[PDB]
């Protein structure tokens, strides 16, 4: 899976940079993911694996990868044709459990993304709400 090998390289190249990650790098990763759309399942697994394994400082970068991929795919293939949001939604509870192990000052950045996802209907509201509830429950 050459296209996946190229995606894996871009995603892991996040390790070669101190956050915040540039738009230029996020674009590169996103472009690689889209070119690898035949193996969208392996792309999703690689992103989820990255989020499970990375240092606290790369949690929000990991979430930005999901955001950037999903929005680019919706734009490029059509909102109802996008394969990425539905696939990312399968393990999304586990993904956010992992994301919420970010530094304290990064929690608001996760909520910001969740609110935008709701506002712009990137994910179904039924999916997003428990993710928000988890954020608030952590603050108590």
């Amino acid at each position: 899976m050459e296209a996946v090998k190229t995606f894996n390289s871009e995603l892991y190249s996040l390790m070669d940079m101190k956050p915040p990650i540039s738009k230029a790098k996020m674009t590169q990763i996103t472009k690689a993911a889209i070119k690898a759309i035949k193996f969208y399942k392996h792309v999703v697994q690689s992103v989820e694996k990255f989020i499970q394994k990375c240092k606290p400082e790369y949690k929000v970068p990991g979430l930005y990868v999901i955001d950037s991929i999903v929005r680019q795919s919706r734009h490029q293939f059509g909102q109802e044709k996008d394969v990425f949001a539905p696939r990312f939604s399968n393990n999304i509870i586990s993904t956010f459990q992992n994301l919420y192990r970010c530094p304290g000052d990064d929690k608001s950045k996760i909520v910001r993304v969740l609110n935008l996802w709701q506002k712009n209907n990137v994910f179904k509201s039924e999916i997003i709400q428990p993710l928000l509830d988890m954020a608030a429950a952590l603050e108590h």
Binding site: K23, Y64, D67, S68, Q72, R74
Partner: peptide
């Protein structure tokens, strides 16, 4: 410029 989740695709 750093990535913003508000920025267009």
């Amino acid at each position: 410029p750093s990535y913003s989740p508000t920025s267009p695709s």
